[PDB]
Amino acid sequence: YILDKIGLNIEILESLSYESKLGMSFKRTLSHFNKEEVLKEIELINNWYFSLEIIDDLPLDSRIKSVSSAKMKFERYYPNATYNRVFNDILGFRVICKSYDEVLELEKEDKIRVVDMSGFRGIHVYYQRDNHHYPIEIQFNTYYDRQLNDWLHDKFY
């Protein structure tokens, strides 16, 4: 299990799932959500991540989406985007694998959805407890895709 080897077994993935307070299923489209309240919730997720001790103990590169980056991503996708498709990356990790084969087997699990992309390249894995929790993003990248991604960063930004 590539996830269990990295630290991200199901108990950890579950205790990392932030339970929304917005009363809204994340299968609804952005049109149904109160932007003022969403942004507040992101502030609280921010505060919650910067106090977690289990992320410290994890051998992983991690990032929380800032309230400013969520606000941009919200307006960029309003009104007809699904919420669990836009805000599927609020908490995110980045790892390198020796191969992609064993990553694409995570599709066959429950609660794990996989988005293959092998300008850029790589494989994104999403754990979502249920439809009123935020999904955790995991970007996988062999050395071949990680150096192409980093090199494209230099000629873009």
Ligand SMILES: Nc1ncnc2c1ncn2[C@@H]1O[C@H](COP(=O)(O)CP(=O)(O)OP(=O)(O)O)[C@@H](O)[C@H]1O
């Ligand atoms: N899953 C991740 N794990 C670790 N670092 C990440 C991850 N995703 C993004 N980052 C880094 O954090 C920066 C900020 O990401 P961001 O502000 O949330 C927009 P980003 O996720 O890169 O693209 P969108 O998903 O389209 O908004 C990125 O430019 C990366 O350097």
Ligand SMILES: [Mg+2]
């Ligand atoms: Mg992202």
